[PDB]
Amino acid sequence: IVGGSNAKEGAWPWVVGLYYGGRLLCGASLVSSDWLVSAAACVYGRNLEPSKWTAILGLHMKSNLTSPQTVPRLIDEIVINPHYNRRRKDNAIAMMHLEFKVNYTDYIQPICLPEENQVFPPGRNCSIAGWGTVVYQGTTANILQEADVPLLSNERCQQQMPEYNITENMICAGYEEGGIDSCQGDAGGPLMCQENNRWFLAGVTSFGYKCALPNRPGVYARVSRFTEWIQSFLH
Amino acid sequence: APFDDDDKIVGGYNCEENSVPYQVSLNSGYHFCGGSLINEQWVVSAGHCYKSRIQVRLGEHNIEVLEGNEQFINAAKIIRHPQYDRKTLNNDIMLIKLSSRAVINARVSTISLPTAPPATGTKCLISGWGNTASSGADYPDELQCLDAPVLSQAKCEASYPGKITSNMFCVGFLEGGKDSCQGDSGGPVVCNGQLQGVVSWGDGCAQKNKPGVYTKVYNYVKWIKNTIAANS
Amino acid sequence: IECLPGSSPCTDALTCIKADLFCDGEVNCPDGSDEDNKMCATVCDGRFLLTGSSGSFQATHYPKPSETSVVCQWIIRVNQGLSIKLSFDDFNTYYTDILDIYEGVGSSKILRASIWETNPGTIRIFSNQVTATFLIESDESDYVGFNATYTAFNSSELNNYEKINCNFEDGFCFWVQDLNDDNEWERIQGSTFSPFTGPNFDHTFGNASGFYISTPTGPGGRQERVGLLSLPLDPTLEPACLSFWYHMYGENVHKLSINISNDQNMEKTVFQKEGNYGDNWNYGQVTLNETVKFKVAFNAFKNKILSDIALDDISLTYGICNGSLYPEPTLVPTPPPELPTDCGGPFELWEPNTTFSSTNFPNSYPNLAFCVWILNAQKGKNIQLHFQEFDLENINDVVEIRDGEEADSLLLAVYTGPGPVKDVFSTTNRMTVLLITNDVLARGGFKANFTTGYHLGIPEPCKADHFQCKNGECVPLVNLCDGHLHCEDGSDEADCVRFFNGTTNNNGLVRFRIQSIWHTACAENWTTQISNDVCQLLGLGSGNSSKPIFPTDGGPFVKLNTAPDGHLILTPSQQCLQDSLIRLQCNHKSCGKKLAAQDITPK
Numbered sequence A: 001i002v003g004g005s006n007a008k009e010g011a012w013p014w015v016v017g018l019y020y021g022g023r024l025l026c027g028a029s030l031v032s033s034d035w036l037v038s039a040a041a042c043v044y045g046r047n048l049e050p051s052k053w054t055a056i057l058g059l060h061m062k063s064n065l066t067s068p069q070t071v072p073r074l075i076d077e078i079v080i081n082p083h084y085n086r087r088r089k090d091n092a093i094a095m096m097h098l099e100f101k102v103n104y105t106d107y108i109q110p111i112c113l114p115e116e117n118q119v120f121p122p123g124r125n126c127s128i129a130g131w132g133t134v135v136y137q138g139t140t141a142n143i144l145q146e147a148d149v150p151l152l153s154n155e156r157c158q159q160q161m162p163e164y165n166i167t168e169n170m171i172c173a174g175y176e177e178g179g180i181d182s183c184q185g186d187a188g189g190p191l192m193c194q195e196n197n198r199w200f201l202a203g204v205t206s207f208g209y210k211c212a213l214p215n216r217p218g219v220y221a222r223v224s225r226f227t228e229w230i231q232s233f234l235h
Numbered sequence B: 001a002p003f004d005d006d007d008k009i010v011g012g013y014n015c016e017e018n019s020v021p022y023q024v025s026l027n028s029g030y031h032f033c034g035g036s037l038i039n040e041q042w043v044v045s046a047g048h049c050y051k052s053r054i055q056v057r058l059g060e061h062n063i064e065v066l067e068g069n070e071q072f073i074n075a076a077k078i079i080r081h082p083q084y085d086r087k088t089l090n091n092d093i094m095l096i097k098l099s100s101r102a103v104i105n106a107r108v109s110t111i112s113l114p115t116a117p118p119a120t121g122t123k124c125l126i127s128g129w130g131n132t133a134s135s136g137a138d139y140p141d142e143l144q145c146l147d148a149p150v151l152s153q154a155k156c157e158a159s160y161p162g163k164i165t166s167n168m169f170c171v172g173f174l175e176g177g178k179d180s181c182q183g184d185s186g187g188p189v190v191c192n193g194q195l196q197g198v199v200s201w202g203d204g205c206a207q208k209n210k211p212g213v214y215t216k217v218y219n220y221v222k223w224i225k226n227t228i229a230a231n232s
Numbered sequence C: 001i002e003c004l005p006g007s008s009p010c011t012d013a014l015t016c017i018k019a020d021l022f023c024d025g026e027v028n029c030p031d032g033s034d035e036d037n038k039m040c041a042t043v044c045d046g047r048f049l050l051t052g053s054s055g056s057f058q059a060t061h062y063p064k065p066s067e068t069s070v071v072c073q074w075i076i077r078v079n080q081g082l083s084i085k086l087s088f089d090d091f092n093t094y095y096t097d098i099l100d101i102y103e104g105v106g107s108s109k110i111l112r113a114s115i116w117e118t119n120p121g122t123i124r125i126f127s128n129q130v131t132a133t134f135l136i137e138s139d140e141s142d143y144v145g146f147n148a149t150y151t152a153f154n155s156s157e158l159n160n161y162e163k164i165n166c167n168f169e170d171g172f173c174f175w176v177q178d179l180n181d182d183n184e185w186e187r188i189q190g191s192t193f194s195p196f197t198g199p200n201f202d203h204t205f206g207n208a209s210g211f212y213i214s215t216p217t218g219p220g221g222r223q224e225r226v227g228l229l230s231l232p233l234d235p236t237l238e239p240a241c242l243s244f245w246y247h248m249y250g251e252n253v254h255k256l257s258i259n260i261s262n263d264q265n266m267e268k269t270v271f272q273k274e275g276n277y278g279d280n281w282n283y284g285q286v287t288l289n290e291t292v293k294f295k296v297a298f299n300a301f302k303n304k305i306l307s308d309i310a311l312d313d314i315s316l317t318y319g320i321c322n323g324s325l326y327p328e329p330t331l332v333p334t335p336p337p338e339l340p341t342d343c344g345g346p347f348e349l350w351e352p353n354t355t356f357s358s359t360n361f362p363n364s365y366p367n368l369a370f371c372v373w374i375l376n377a378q379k380g381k382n383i384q385l386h387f388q389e390f391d392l393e394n395i396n397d398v399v400e401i402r403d404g405e406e407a408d409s410l411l412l413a414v415y416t417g418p419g420p421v422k423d424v425f426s427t428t429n430r431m432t433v434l435l436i437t438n439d440v441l442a443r444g445g446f447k448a449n450f451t452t453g454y455h456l457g458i459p460e461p462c463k464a465d466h467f468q469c470k471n472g473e474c475v476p477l478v479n480l481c482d483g484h485l486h487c488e489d490g491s492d493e494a495d496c497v498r499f500f501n502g503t504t505n506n507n508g509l510v511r512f513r514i515q516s517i518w519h520t521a522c523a524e525n526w527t528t529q530i531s532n533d534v535c536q537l538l539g540l541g542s543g544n545s546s547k548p549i550f551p552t553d554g555g556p557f558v559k560l561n562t563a564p565d566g567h568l569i570l571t572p573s574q575q576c577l578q579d580s581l582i583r584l585q586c587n588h589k590s591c592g593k594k595l596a597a598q599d600i601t602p603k
Ligand SMILES: *[C@@H]1O[C@H](CO)[C@@H](O[C@@H]2O[C@H](CO)[C@@H](O[C@@H]3O[C@H](CO)[C@@H](O)[C@H](O[C@H]4O[C@H](CO)[C@@H](O)[C@H](O)[C@@H]4O)[C@@H]3O)[C@H](O)[C@H]2NC(C)=O)[C@H](O)[C@H]1NC(C)=O
Pocket: C259, C267, C268, C269
């Protein structure tokens, strides 16, 4: 996918991995003590059997699931946003309920949701996370990657990718010359923006056209307008 | 009425199919056949895959990129089944002895031999570098998998009359489309954690309503044990 | 004189040369002892050089089967400009045994032939030097031994008939395999690997007892080019006709061509066929030109596995080619992609129409199908799908059920995989059923019920003004924000404490509800415990103390009673005077503040 870098231990405590059938299929974020926020597209068609989903909290390396800092958990309830379409790829955000609960620790922390009428200005650098690949396809990296990419306004996003509706329900991040992206390969985590002195769940990894290609913005699911829906299930 | 004769097979990319220590590959300058590892020196592979020079790769994940976790042991002796029939592709099983003992780790290990014959409808897993692509020629270099329950004997016999015996069984209920681009040869067939057979042949790359044929190794367990005892 | 590893000294021990140079046909030692027959003691027959016109040799263990791996090499030398023809009657072995015929001697050899477990037939080498390398790669009892009969012939006085005609029974005849190809042609008796690809019998003989050439049958996965070359043809005063039989069977057949080449560099193609032509031997007819010396070739492009192309029964005649009695070959019909697009089928149905197959549920459903079912019911009536039978693929095939009557449809449930599935209840009087299919593994399908009615999924409300939770359990007063687990949904334990007229999101006045009425609270004394209790009730993080502003409200205030267990006790008894509004202040829970000392990478 190009653009990844090394991630320190505990750098992203709210990034968790989702395993279905023994393989890392998608990613999620830790918001509360019993709920996760993940992409609805990658969990579609597998919500009838939540027992087959393995939620790994505090994961740092693909083949090092032995440290005590990582506490595996199961998923019992899976809910998908009713506004999802699967044809326009609109509102690809779904929530997964943990088995019982998770104890807060240094390497496992929640992430604050955006408040009402809180929009991150475009052009502000934000971090991305996920267990993506170095090349466009294949050769999955065993170490969590991190990169900084400024937000792209939807006005130019709808023109740079004249294939979707985009509308106001998506947030685009990318570069004019490309190089840094997280849309394809594997989500493995959401889009995080930090203002004041704390990160926020600004976006969730979504579909895309190409990785490390110029004039190919990376689409991310907008969470500012979905704060109420998430908070309805958080408590 | 021009045509192109192309299709695709269901996606089975997985997470590069890791945590599969019983999967091995046979190399003679390129990947041609697969196989399974049964002990520290013997492997199970299809009889038709016999070649003068074969290199056995242990725990391989990419056929073109070396990640440093692959064991390369050259083949020392290859024994084919004495009752192999090339015309009918019956008794399509052979054993290859590694020159040096394998190193057992998280990526290389052995799978226990089956003790009971497979049953109809039993869930099975097939591992191999299959040809999965959206369109065109985009053959991947990563290990893949695909579930395949065992079908009934009568249906298997009726599917290919004159070419099916008691040592063969169908792949599964999967139609498989019209890909017609085979990419699996000698791939392990594991049912309930036991190697019930290997990939032998089929009518194309699992053409619609015509599944492939796998060589059952339950009847060959005694032959494998005798071969191991005679060439320990 | 000491020699480095990988090299061996000569008999005189004066010069060190490569180990492979010994007994290879190249004289490198000063005394010429490297080619001595006694020095090259192969033990097979005691001889190494065969300078005679004709002869034969034996292998190790002549009277008894061999039991030890022995390497033997033989070199035959004849007059310059003459070729050697190797003829074999019947050869068998224990798999691992290759004669390893090579072109010439020394380091210039590449490969000539390699036949194991089968009779090679007849092998012709167009050189004055022929080399063989007997090898054993097994410790078992292999074959007794190997012999070869050869005879010298001029090979340049041959006419066009002998050069061209070859039915593939006496080996490859005089055809020379190209040395600039990815792989060489293979002559295999009977049927070969890759079922439904390649001939099952020989054309010349009629059954499996015959021999034919074809592309390599190994289960490879790379594109390769194979080629066969012939001797130059002498000029003729009459045009000649070239006849051959080609069998191009397989879904991945790329191209077959002749590509005649001449000494004038005016190469041209006279025959070219592409694609599959069925499991039948087709007749190829070629007219000849280019009286000057030219070579007839058969360039075949080999694709991945299941792309076998075979040739047999090459013959030559004279005169203009007659009318081809055999019909011109035609390509296979091929499964036609007749624009699957979207079948559509039924779209809307009403109450009289309830039972319906998906598309062809008894048999299967078509691939690439996007079927839309519009379930319309009367006003005020809900719709219950009540699936009867459901058999999809697993994760690819999905049945999507949404709520209609609006542009922004609301997803209700997603069903996939085998086995029965639960019923679906729609919010309004319209349900949309979507079937997304894939191009592979199309199961039988699904069948619905289309049940409609009033309050299909809504339980009967409780009487006597009793509150009801989501699970339907009756909760009159017991679990009205009292902190219990009567209903697993938790709706009966909804937050009865909230802010009112505050400055920000985490700010507000006192507002506590006991059962169904919101009211203020008494906080004349304030400590850390009550602040923590308020924070816990509001679901916030750690908080601190707060102070009132002015007693602007004199309504029915309710005192707050704390407990050592953290539970808040509400006493509806205003035993106080001059009540004042109290501001509730708390902070949010600890979020993902960065702690690791992340480095800086300006890249
Ligand atoms: C018989 O085999 C020979 C050797 O394999 C083969 O000769 C090769 O032919 C190809 C194409 O016929 C040549 O490739 C060409 O190279 C030139 C110069 O680089 C290009 O301009 C060509 O591009 C165009 O070629 C055609 C016009 O001539 C166009 O119709 C076409 O659409 C392309 O746009 C092409 O790439 C190659 O150089 C030779 N190799 C040699 C001469 O060594 C020959 O074609 C075969 N068939 C015969 C003789 O019938």
